[PDB]
C-alpha cells in the first residue's frame, strides 16, 4: 500500500499534461477605421488616375469591464467594383479614370487584436463562434481640390454592415507581427446614396472610396467571441545540506502509535499530494516532476536490472550464466563469514521482494513512505523544484539496514543486510545453526516477512513480557493489530525498536 | 443544452427499481476499469 | 428541536384580548379612500372604534400609499399584524399579483451582478425580482459554450423582452440554462430570491372584482389562501367598518412571524 | 375489454409492458397570432425547442400550430398529436364561444350526420347534443307535439321558428330531450351533426392566458366544474407566458394522459 | 369495460358455433360505395342509386343504410381521402401511368396509419423502423431530400443550395416516401399547397375494400420488395360496362362484407 505508491509511480513512469484545451469568452469593442488612397494624375489637376482603398491600421486603448485594454484593428475591403466617369478628352474637364465603389458582391475584412490573454499565444483554434451586431457606415465630404473652376464634393453614401463568418489571420507590420482574428462582414446598400456635387452623377448607391470615415475618430461596434484553443498549462509561456537537518529535527518529534495507524493506509498520489498546500505550478506539475527523478535512482535501476537478469536467466540457459547459485539452481533472487556475506547480498534483493508485492507484513518501505508523508506535510521547506530527488533520497536512505525472515514447518530463518542470521523455533525460542542452501531455496519462492519484531527484541519480550501462542504467531506474521495492541500496552521493548526505526528514517 | 438535473433525477426515478439481484451481485464482482466503464456507456 | 404533547390536556383561555394589547396593527389603504372620505379625524375615529374591540389607541397605524405600483416599490412592512386594501384593475392584474407574491411570501434574497456574471435558476422557487421606478428587462439564454439561442450576447436588440416600464417585476425563466440580462440598473435594482415559507403576518383584501390572484407561478394549483380575502364595494366607510367589525377573524387568519 | 383485473397492496411489482412508438411523446402548442405578433421574431420556435430539450423533449417532438382566432380554430379543429396544449386569451364577449370550444375539445364526441329536410330529430339523454360547424351558422328550432304539429311556431313560416344561433361559426345546441324538433340551418355554409358525449379527452389541455375561470364545460348549470387540465395564467407579455409553460411543462404532462379509445385527427368520431 | 388496457382472454373448445349475425349486421351497419364519374357518365340515368338501393333491399341491406360517394378521379380521391363509414367499398380503375399513385392510395386506405405532424423549417428528421414513412398530400407536391452525415453535413448535397437535393416526387397529389432508416434528412417541400405528415403503419384497416376494375393485380402495399402480397380485401374484375360490375357487387356483397370486418380502433 504505502509501497504500492512506489509501485504506482513506477507503473505510471510512461507518463513522464503540458498542454490543455481552454475556453475563452470575452467582450470586445471593435473600434476600426477606413482609409483611402487618392492618386492624382499630372497635368493641370482635373484628371484623377485612381481613388482606391488601403489597409487601414489603427492602434488604441479602451476600457473593458474594469480592465484597461490595448488593442489594434486593421480594416480592409475585397471585391469592390471599379467605376469611371469621363467628362471629356481635355486636360481641363473633370475626369476620374477609376474610382472604387462598394456593393453587395464585395466584402469587408477586419483583423482584430488585443493585449489580453486570449491573444497572447493564439496559434490553434477550434469551435470558433462569435456574436456581432450590425452598424451603418457612411461617407463624408471629399472636396476635389481643383486649382480653378467649381468645387466638386463627393458626398453621401451609406451602407449597412451585417456580420459574417470569422477566421484567423496574421497582421504584419514593420514593427510587430500579431496573430489576429479575422472578422468578416457582408454589406447591404442603404437609402442615402453617394453623389458628387456640381457633376452629372447622383442617385447611385454604395460607399464612396474617398472619405468613408466621415471625419470620425473610429467606427465603434461591440462584439463577443468564443473558441477552444491550445495553450501551455503553465500559464507563463509567451541553491540538501539544510533539508537533511530539518528531517533530523522532525524525526523524533513524530509519534509512534499514530504513525503505525497511518502506515496501513494506501496513500495514493491524490492522498499524498492533497495535504500539501502547493503552489499554482506545483499542484499542476508535482507528480511527473518527482517521477522523472524517481526513475533515475539506484532503486529503479536495481529493479530494472533484476528484471533484466531474470529475463536473461530464463533465456540464457543453453549458455546459462554460471556466475554462482547456492541452492537448487540459478534464480537471480539468490545471486552471490561467507554465510553472513551471502545473506547480506540476498537481503539487498529482499528489499526488492519488499517493493515487488511479495511480502506479508509491515513492508518496511511502507513505514518509510509513512514517515515521508508525515514529514513533508510539516516541513516548511517544501517546493516544486525541491521535492523531486527528496522523495528519492528518502526512498534510498530510509532504513538502510533492515532484516527479513522466512517460516517453514515452525522454524524461522532470519537474515539481515548487517551480516546477521538467526535460526529459531516459534514456540520455544532457542537458536539453531543457520541452514544455508535451504534458507535460500525457501526465501526464493515462499513468501518473506519483515523484521519489525526482530529476534533480539522478540526474545527480550518473550523473556520479560511473557507471551501467548497466538500473540507470538501474529508477531511473527507482523500483524498491525497485535503490534498496535502492544504499542498501547506500552511495551518498552517494542517502543525502543520503533524509535530505532524512526531514527533510521532520518535522511 | 443537455438537461435539467431535476429531470435527470426523474430519469433515475424512471429507472427506479428494476435491477435484478442475481445480475446485480454478478455485476458487482468485476474490476470495471476505466476502459470498460467509459467504452460501453 | 422536537416537540411532544398529549390529547388529555384541556384547552387554554382565549389569547384574544391579550394579543391585541401586546401587538400592533397596520392598515395600508389607498389615497382614493382618504379622498372619498374627506375628513381629518377618520383615523382617530377608527382608533376609538378599535378601542371597543380592545385594540388600544397606540397600537393601530394607518400607512397611506398613492398607488399599487408605488407601494410595490420597496414595501417596508414592519408590524406585528399587517392588513392591505387592494383595488382591482384588469390593466394592473399582474402587478397586483406580483405584489401579493412578494408580501404574502417571505423571500431569501441575494444581490445580482449582471454585467460581470451570468445566472441561472436552480429550483422552481429561485426567481428574479426587480423593483424601481421604471424597469425594462431583457433576457438572452445561452448554451453550454456561452453562445446565444435566438439572441446575441452583445446585440441587445436581439434579446427577448419580458418586462417594459414596470415598477415591480417577478421573473421566472427556464431552470437550468445560464441567462444574460439587460436591465435599467440606474432606475431598478434586481435580486435573486428563493421563496421560503409564507409570511403569515400580512392579509390582502381585494376591494373589487373576483379572485384573480395566482400566487403559484405553476399554472396547476392556483391556490386561494386564508389571508387573501375579497369584498364588494360602493363606498369606503362601509369597507372600513367591515374591517373593524371582522378584525378578529382577520387576526385569527393571520399568525405572527417565527423569524 | 370486459374481463377483470386484479391487484394487491404489499407488492412492488415493477413488471410492465415495454414497447416502442414515435419517440416516447409528441407535443403540439396552439398559440394565437397575437403572440408571434408581439414577439416579432423568426427563431422563437427553435428557441423553445432547444429550451424544451432541457426538460427532455427531443428535437423532432415539439410543434406549433398558429391559429388566427378562437372561431377559426373552432372551425374543424384537427388535433393529431400525443399531447396538445391550447393557449386561449380571455374576452368577456366570447365566453360562450370559448366554453363551446372547451366542451368540444376536452370531451370526446360520437357524431352522426343529420338531414334537416327529410327528417325531424330529437335528443334522448342529457348528453345527446347537436353541434354545428362552418363559417356563419344561423339556426332556428321549432318544437313539436304528439300530433306532428308545432308549438308556438308553424311548419311553413320559417320566421315563426325560434332563433338560438346568430352569426356563429361553432354552435353546440342542447334542446328539450324527448320531443321532436324541426330545424332550419344555413346548410350551404354549415354542417350540423347529432353528437353524443363520451368520457373525456385526456390528451388536450386548455390554458386561459387571462381572466378568471369562466368555462362551464358541463351544459347543466348546477355543476360548473373545473378539471385538472384547465389552467389559468395572468399575463402582460407572451415571452414570459411561454417561459412559464416551459418551466412547468412537466406538470402539464403529469396532468395530461394519452388517449384510450383510439387514434383520430378531428375532435369527434364519425359513426354514421 | 376496461378500455386503454389489454388483458388475457380465455375460452374453450366445447362451445358450439352460434347463429348467423348476417341479416342483422346489415341492418345495424352501413355500406358506402366509392364509384368513378365514368360510371355515372356511361350510365346516364338519374334513378340508378334508388335502383341499386331497392336491389340491396333484396339482399337485406335496408334503404337508408347504403351510400354512394362520387369522385372525379383517383388523384382527386387520393387528395385527403376521408373514409368514415362502417363498410367501405372502392371501385378503382387501372392506368399503367397511375400505378404508383393508386398503389400509394391502397397502402394508405387499406391500412391504419398513426400520423404525427412535421415542420421542415426547424428540424431534420430520421426514420426509426421500416414502417415509419412520410406521407404528403396536396394539389402539387414537389419533395426534395438531402441526407446528412454524422456531423450534420450533406451527402452529395449542400444544406443551402436546394438545387443539389435529391428529387423523389415531382408535382404529385399524393406521395408516400420511405428513406434509409438511421440517417437525418433535410427536406424541401411546397408547404403552401402540400402538407407532409410522419406516419407509422399500424395493423391493417379491415373496414375498406378495394376492387380493381381493369388490369392485372399490381398493387404492392408492403413497401419492402420481398412480399408483394395479395390481401383478402384486394379484389379484381375485368370490365366492359359498369351495370354488370354493379350487379356483380350487389350479388356478391355478402362475400365482400365477409372479407371485411368492423374496425378495432
Ligand atoms: C522538541 O520537541 C518536543 C517534542 O518532540 C517539543 O515539545 C519541544 O518544544 C521541542 N523543542 C523546542 C525548543 O521547541
Ligand atoms: C379562563 O376562563 C375561565 C372562565 O371564563 C376563568 O374562570 C379562568 O380564570 C380563565 N383563566 C385564567 C388563567 O384566568
Ligand atoms: C416481477 O418480477 C419479479 C422479479 O423479476 C418477480 O419476483 C415478481 O413475481 C414479478 N411479478 C409478478 C406479478 O409475477
Ligand atoms: C339459431 O338457428 C337455429 C336454426 O336455424 C334456430 O332454431 C335458433 O332459434 C337460432 N337461435 C336463436 C337465438 O334464435
Ligand atoms: Ca423557475
Ligand atoms: Ca431574439
Ligand atoms: Ca409587474
Ligand atoms: Ca358559439
Ligand atoms: Ca315563436
Ligand atoms: Ca338536452
Ligand atoms: Ca403518387
Ligand atoms: Ca424506412
Ligand atoms: Ca446532388
From Swiss-Prot, chain D:
N-glycosylated. The N-terminus is blocked possibly by pyroglutamic acid. The keyword Metal-binding applies. Keywords: Calcium, Capsid protein, Disulfide bond, Glycoprotein, Host endoplasmic reticulum, Host-virus interaction, Metal-binding, Outer capsid protein, Signal, T=13 icosahedral capsid protein, Virion. Residues 111-113 are annotated as: CNP motif. Residues 199-201 are annotated as: GPR motif. Ca(2+) 1 binds at residues 41, 152, 160, 162. One of its GO terms (molecular function) is metal ion binding. Some rotavirus strains are neuraminidase-sensitive and require sialic acid to attach to the cell surface. Some rotavirus strains are integrin-dependent. Some rotavirus strains depend on ganglioside for their entry into the host cell. Hsp70 also seems to be involved in the entry of some strains. In group A rotaviruses, VP7 defines the G serotype. Belongs to the rotavirus VP7 family. This is Outer capsid glycoprotein VP7. It comes from Rotavirus A (strain RVA/Monkey/United States/RRV/1975/G3P5B[3]) (RV-A). The chain holds residues 55 to 326 of 326 of the full protein.
Amino acid at each position: 500500500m504505502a509501497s504500492l505508491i512506489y509501485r504506482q509511480l513506477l507503473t505510471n513512469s510512461y507518463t513522464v499534461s503540458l498542454w490543455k484545451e481552454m475556453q475563452y469568452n470575452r467582450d470586445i469593442t471593435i473600434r476600426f477605421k477606413f482609409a483611402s488612397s487618392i492618386v492624382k494624375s499630372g497635368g493641370l489637376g482635373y484628371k484623377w488616375s485612381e481613388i482606391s482603398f488601403k489597409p487601414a491600421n489603427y492602434q488604441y486603448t479602451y476600457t473593458r469591464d474594469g480592465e484597461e485594454v490595448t488593442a489594434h484593428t486593421t480594416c480592409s475591403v475585397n471585391g469592390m467594383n471599379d467605376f469611371n466617369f469621363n467628362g471629356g478628352s481635355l486636360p481641363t474637364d473633370f475626369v476620374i479614370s477609376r474610382y472604387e465603389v462598394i456593393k453587395e458582391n464585395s466584402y469587408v475584412y477586419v483583423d482584430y487584436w488585443d493585449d489580453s490573454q486570449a491573444f497572447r499565444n493564439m496559434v490553434y483554434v477550434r469551435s470558433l463562434a462569435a456574436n456581432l451586431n450590425s452598424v451603418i457606415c457612411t461617407g463624408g465630404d471629399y472636396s476635389f481640390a481643383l486649382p480653378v473652376g467649381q468645387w466638386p464634393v463627393m458626398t453621401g453614401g451609406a451602407v449597412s454592415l451585417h456580420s459574417a463568418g470569422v477566421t484567423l489571420s496574421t497582421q504584419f507590420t514593420d514593427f510587430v507581427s500579431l496573430n489576429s482574428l479575422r472578422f468578416r462582414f457582408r454589406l447591404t446598400v442603404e437609402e442615402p446614396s453617394f453623389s458628387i456635387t456640381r457633376t452629372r452623377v447622383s442617385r447611385l448607391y454604395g460607399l464612396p472610396a474617398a472619405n468613408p470615415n466621415n471625419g470620425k475618430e473610429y467606427y465603434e461596434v461591440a462584439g463577443r467571441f468564443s473558441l477552444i484553443s491550445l495553450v501551455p498549462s503553465n500559464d507563463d509561456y509567451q541553491l540538501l545540506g539544510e533539508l537533511r537537518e530539518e528531517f533530523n529535527a522532525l524525526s523524533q518529534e513524530i509519534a509512534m502509535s499514530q504513525l503505525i495507524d497511518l502506515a496501513l493506509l494506501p496513500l495514493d498520489m491524490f492522498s499524498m499530494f492533497s495535504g500539501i498546500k502547493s503552489t499554482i505550478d506545483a499542484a499542476k506539475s508535482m507528480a511527473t516532476s518527482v517521477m522523472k527523478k524517481f526513475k533515475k535512482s539506484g532503486l529503479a535501476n536495481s529493479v530494472s536490472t533484476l528484471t533484466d537478469c531474470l529475463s536473461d536467466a530464463a533465456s540464457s540457459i543453453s549458455r546459462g550464466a554460471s556466475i554462482r547459485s547456492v541452492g537448487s539452481s540459478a534464480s537471480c533472487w539468490t545471486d552471490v563469514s561467507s554465510i553472513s556475506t551471502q545473506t547480506s547480498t540476498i537481503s539487498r534483493r529482499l528489499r526488492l521482494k519488499e517493493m515487488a508485492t511479495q511480502t506479508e507484513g509491515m513492508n518496511f518501505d511502507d513505514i518509510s513512505a509513512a514517515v515521508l508523508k508525515t514529514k513533508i506535510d510539516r516541513s516548511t521547506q517544501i517546493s516544486p523544484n525541491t521535492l523531486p530527488d527528496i522523495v528519492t533520497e528518502a526512498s534510498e536512505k530510509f532504513i538502510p539496514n533492515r532484516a527479513y525472515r522466512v517460516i517453514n514447518n515452525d522454524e524461522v530463518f532470519e537474515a539481515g543486510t548487517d551480516g546477521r542470521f538467526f535460526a529459531y523455533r516459534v514456540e520455544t525460542f532457542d537458536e539453531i545453526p543457520f541452514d544455508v542452501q535451504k534458507f535460500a531455496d525457501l526465501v526464493t519462492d515462499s513468501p518473506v516477512i519483515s523484521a519489525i519484531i526482530d529476534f533480539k527484541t522478540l526474545k527480550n519480550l518473550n523473556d520479560n513480557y511473557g507471551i501467548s501462542r497466538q500473540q507470538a504467531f501474529n508477531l511473527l506474521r507482523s500483524d498491525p493489530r497485535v503490534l498496535r495492541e502492544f504499542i498501547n500496552q506500552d511495551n518498552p521493548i517494542i517502543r525502543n525498536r520503533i524509535e530505532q526505526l524512526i531514527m533510521q528514517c532520518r535522511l | 443544452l443537455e438537461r435539467q438535473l431535476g429531470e435527470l433525477r426523474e430519469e433515475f426515478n424512471a429507472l427506479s427499481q428494476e435491477i435484478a439481484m442475481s445480475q446485480l451481485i454478478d455485476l458487482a464482482l468485476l474490476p470495471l476499469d476505466m476502459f470498460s466503464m467509459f467504452s460501453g456507456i | 428541536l422536537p416537540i411532544t404533547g398529549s390529547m388529555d390536556t384541556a384547552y387554554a383561555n382565549s389569547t384574544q384580548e391579550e394579543t391585541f394589547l401586546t401587538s400592533t396593527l397596520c392598515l395600508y389603504y389607498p389615497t382614493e379612500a382618504a379622498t372619498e372620505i374627506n375628513d381629518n379625524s377618520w383615523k382617530d375615529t377608527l382608533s376609538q372604534l378599535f378601542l371597543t374591540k380592545g385594540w388600544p389607541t397606540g397600537s393601530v397605524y394607518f400607512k397611506e400609499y398613492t398607488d399599487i405600483a408605488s407601494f410595490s416599490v420597496d414595501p417596508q412592512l414592519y408590524c406585528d399584524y399587517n392588513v392591505v386594501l387592494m383595488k382591482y384593475d384588469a390593466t394592473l392584474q399582474l402587478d397586483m399579483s406580483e405584489l401579493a407574491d412578494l408580501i404574502l411570501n417571505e423571500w431569501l434574497c441575494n444581490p445580482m451582478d449582471i454585467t460581470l456574471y451570468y445566472y441561472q435558476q436552480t429550483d422552481e422557487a429561485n426567481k428574479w425580482i426587480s423593483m424601481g421606478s421604471s424597469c425594462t428587462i431583457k433576457v438572452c439564454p445561452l448554451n453550454t459554450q456561452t453562445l446565444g439561442i435566438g439572441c446575441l450576447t452583445t446585440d441587445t436588440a436581439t434579446f427577448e423582452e419580458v418586462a417594459t416600464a414596470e415598477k415591480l417585476v417577478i421573473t421566472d425563466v427556464v431552470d437550468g440554462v445560464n441567462h444574460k440580462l439587460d436591465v435599467t440598473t440606474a432606475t431598478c435594482t434586481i435580486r435573486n430570491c428563493k421563496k421560503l415559507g409564507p409570511r403569515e403576518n400580512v392579509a390582502v383584501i381585494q376591494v373589487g372584482g373576483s379572485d384573480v390572484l395566482d400566487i403559484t407561478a405553476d399554472p396547476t394549483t392556483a391556490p386561494q389562501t386564508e389571508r387573501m380575502m375579497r369584498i364588494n364595494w360602493k363606498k369606503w366607510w362601509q369597507v372600513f367598518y367591515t374591517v373593524v367589525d371582522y378584525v378578529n377573524q382577520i387576526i385569527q387568519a393571520m399568525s405572527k412571524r417565527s423569524r
